[PDB]
């Protein structure tokens, strides 16, 4: 009834659908907004330019 031979050996070859390959993992540079310095009013020196 279970499709075996007289000895119990199976009569139908099975299948399992081999796992799908390796996987690629990558890294990336990340950038963010950056500001600059400010300028203040200047002092008046005692010396010439």
């Amino acid at each position: 009834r279970h499709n075996l031979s007289i000895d119990g050996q199976p009569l139908s070859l099975a299948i399992y659908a081999e796992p799908t390959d390796p996987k690629a993992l990558l890294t990336s540079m990340v950038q963010a907004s950056q500001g600059g310095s400010a300028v203040l009013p200047g002092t008046l020196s005692l010396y010439r330019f």
Binding site: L25, L26, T27, S28, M29, V30, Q31, A32, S33
Partner: protein, 49 residues
Amino acid sequence: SVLVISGFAVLGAKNQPAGQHNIDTLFSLYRFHQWINGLGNPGSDTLDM
């Protein structure tokens, strides 16, 4: 830079106050970092948005 300036609201937290340091928030940080890396070159733009 983005996470700290935003008060860690970008990362978020489930039912907890954001910005806490523990194994759960570190785990969330690790998974968020993996997502950013996988985005590729537009990763910086996606983070900005």
